[PDB]
Design a binder for these strands. Structure first.
Lengths: 83, 88
RNA sequence: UUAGGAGCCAGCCGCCGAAGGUGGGACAGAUGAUUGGGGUGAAGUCGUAACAAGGUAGCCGUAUCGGAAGGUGCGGCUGG
RNA sequence: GGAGAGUUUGAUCCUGGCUCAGGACGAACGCUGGCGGCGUGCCUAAUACAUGCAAGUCGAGCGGACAGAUGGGAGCUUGCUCCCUGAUGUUAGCGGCGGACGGGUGAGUAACACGUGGGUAACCUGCCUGUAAGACUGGGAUAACUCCGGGAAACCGGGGCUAAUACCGGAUGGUUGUUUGAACCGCAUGGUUCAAACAUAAAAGGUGGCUUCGGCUACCACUUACAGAUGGACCCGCGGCGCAUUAGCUAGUUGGUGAGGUAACGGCUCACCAAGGCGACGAUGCGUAGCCGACCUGAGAGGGUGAUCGGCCACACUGGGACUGAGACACGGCCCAGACUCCUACGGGAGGCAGCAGUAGGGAAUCUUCCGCAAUGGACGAAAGUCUGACGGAGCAACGCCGCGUGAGUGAUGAAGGUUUUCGGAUCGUAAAGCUCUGUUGUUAGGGAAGAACAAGUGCCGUUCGAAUAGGGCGGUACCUUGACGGUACCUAACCAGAAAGCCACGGCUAACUACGUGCCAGCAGCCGCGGUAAUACGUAGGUGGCAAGCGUUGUCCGGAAUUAUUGGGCGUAAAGGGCUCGCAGGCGGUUUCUUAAGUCUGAUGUGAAAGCCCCCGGCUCAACCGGGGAGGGUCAUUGGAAACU
RNA sequence: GUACGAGAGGACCGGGAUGGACGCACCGCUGGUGUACCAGUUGUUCUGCCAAGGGCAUCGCUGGGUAGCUAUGUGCGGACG
RNA sequence: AAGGAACUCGGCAAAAUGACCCCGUAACUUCGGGAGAAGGGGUGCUCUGUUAGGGUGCAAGCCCGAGAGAGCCGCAGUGAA
């Protein structure tokens, strides 16, 4: 309205791109947790590195804000410790 | 953001100024932390009075003033004493 | 390496979810014919109940009757 | 640093009411009104809003357009037309950061919102410094651009082209997590430090110079880490209301465990299990209202108010959600509904003034649709600069405070005139006239501040990097340059008594009185009360008195009101002892001694920001106002003392 | 908006269009009934059982329903003389 | 179908409501009630289940079936009376 139309034209374009980082981060965690219902540790090890690949790059991009991601790390990490 | 700066006081026509360490987010008459002495523009002579020592402790923490405030410190050598500390 | 997988989104789905609708209660205010007292005003009418031993010594509480102030009943009180 | 006065009565003292003198207003109204500083100026409607402006910034992030002519060349009319990319200029879009601050309003909210003191081992912080490290190697897009398509518009869709400090992979990294060791310590969770292992986790270039054309260099930006600086979130004691004709209230309520979730602790969410929690020190409820430094008042204790200026929270037409971003659930952003306004070709859309002004409307009632970014400030940028209804000033209304006037000396004749009169006079009285007088201001013409410090560019010297005396960086000084107010303040000279006073009172409170009119009528009245024919109380006139550019009335709040009495009352009959008991809770304690330190006493430390009150100076022609310094303010916290009293 | 009227008001006479009121007719269309039509579904029995059906439960109930008779549905009717 | 008391002396008649579980309940009150007031909600099938749990028995097995999660179905889910 006061020439801040340029914000909404970018805010929606960022809203698509940010959620693709966010939703793929969610699928990485469940696939690790899929290997918790599954009785596989070696599959969980390579998935933990696959999950933390997205997690560590997530705070590098935008709002995931590491103090969450530390809880995202260790909660996955004790399950591999549980196996 | 932390700008040591002036602060507008006094009557309508003849202003008065106080040199103030504060945050720029607070308004022109906004709040602050601790002040240094004075400024007088309406005197055709002198009487710009500075504490001359307390701001150097703040400059070692880092607080960038505007140049209209800063050249009063040059007139009393606060910055050049501080630049010696930066050369120290 | 002529494409599959990964991931992604459209889409639909679920919980939550504001406003809307429905329903019987709460309280708040205007209003309601008529009535019930309460004061408030020019020499209105009716009595004289108080204040004197007020012409039957008054007075509180209860009961009861009458145009109406009141009346007496019973107990209590001196400010009889 | 503490005044009282009229009134019950035939008369007196008490008792007890109200009345009155005082002080403030963000005040309004009536009558009048000359000026100057300084300050405020929608409280009712957080009701609805025409129009313009109130937040953008970087071509040194980047592609392209866009002009350009340094020259080069072309066709000729000598009038031109060009084709290359000059210096440089413009910035739709892209991307970076800001828009969350600045600014307003006072609706909800009686609670950790705020005020005060705390705690965090339970947290966060882009833009700031300082230190530590750095900044490797690639990739795929896409806007703009066009080319079509669909739309009344709002605009939207499709196909190619393209960029970056945009976006996305690979490496290396002292983040973090995991695993296993150690060391030390706290206040339980624990915390801090050190080692090893594993796992990933980045970054960017741009500007100018120097170049061996490999690059290098400063500077800006970038990634990461440490601290400090910085604000924010959460928790906690202690404070400031009205009602008991509100006594019972709550089931995520209250507990535990685990789980998820949040930057973070948690019923914050959910499962499970338990039945607790909140309460006569007043829960729950309801009406009410933003809080605070402070403002006003009082002698103080207190009481009232919470406007402006300063702190913080909450809200942005009403309600709900959510994104990007360090930070919002976003005042001038999106999405949704609700009302309403506007447009439509009826298919669709756009809109939010409690931003500055202004208008409607409400109401007793509150202002200018100005100029300027010169100073202060912010925003971005390397800077100039740009942007600023913050702010700077101008304009309105006696709205209030303070400051100055409205002539002044002389002048008796007690002029004239007016009023009154026992007709001698009295007063309006030295008041006018006369004479003399200056010019604040009014008027005319001149002169003309400080606010303006600077930045930036030039000059050097110092230091710092540097392949370097390149080239910079800061640091010093030197030159240059910048006014909305405004020729306004101001000062200079010239001009005239010439421009300029009123309202209120006049029995007693209460300073000041007569004459006419008037006859329970007209009318006054705050109080006692005045008038049925001599009204000092009505109305008028004269004359006093009051105060002054104002005066009265009005509504408010405080005071006097010791008349809610802690300081600072009562209870035999004046208003007031419960009809009397038994008593739980709460209230209070004999004597002697030891001890303790909750109360108490006291030091030290930390803090209660600034403005304001107050102590004292200084500045404005004084004042008001403004400035400098200091005190004071806390049932405050920690710490160390004291032991009579509790 | 004419004569008329001061205005306010407001025409006869004459053309065209469209309705209400009842009247005859019908089923193409909106629906209505359609108990020897089809689909689902409950209780219980029966065809040896499952499957798949049958009976009875008011057509068991509920959603549709073709022909048929129907009205509020559609046509025309009381015309011009 | 559209309509709802216009019908009529009048909601007469007829439809509408019903089951069990669960939430919620006013005025007044002789405190017993009023009350099942009203007002709505979930009910079927299959899987976690030879269930949680109970009864019964010596065990073996039988009966009773609480709550949820899952999911499939039709318009409907005490589908009938």
């Amino acid at each position: 309205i006061k020439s801040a139309i340029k914000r909404t034209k970018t805010n929606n374009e960022r809203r698509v791109h940010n959620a693709t980082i966010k939703s793929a981060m969610r699928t990485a965690i469940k696939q690790v947790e899929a290997s918790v219902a599954n009785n596989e540790a070696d599959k969980a090890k390579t998935a933990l590195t696959e999950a933390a690949k997205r997690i560590d790059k997530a705070v590098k991009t935008g709002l995931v804000h590491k103090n969450t991601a530390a809880r995202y790390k260790s909660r996955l990490a004790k399950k591999v410790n549980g196996l | 953001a932390v700008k040591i700066r002036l602060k507008r006081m006094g009557a309508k026509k003849s202003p008065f100024y106080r040199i103030v360490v504060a945050d720029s987010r607070s308004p022109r008459d906004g709040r602050f932390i601790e002040t240094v002495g004075t400024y007088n523009p309406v005197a055709k002579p002198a009487e710009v009075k500075i504490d001359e020592e307390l701001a150097l402790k703040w400059l070692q923490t880092g607080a960038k003033p505007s140049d209209t405030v800063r050249n009063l410190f040059s007139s009393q050598g606060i910055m050049e004493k501080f630049h010696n500390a930066k050369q120290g």
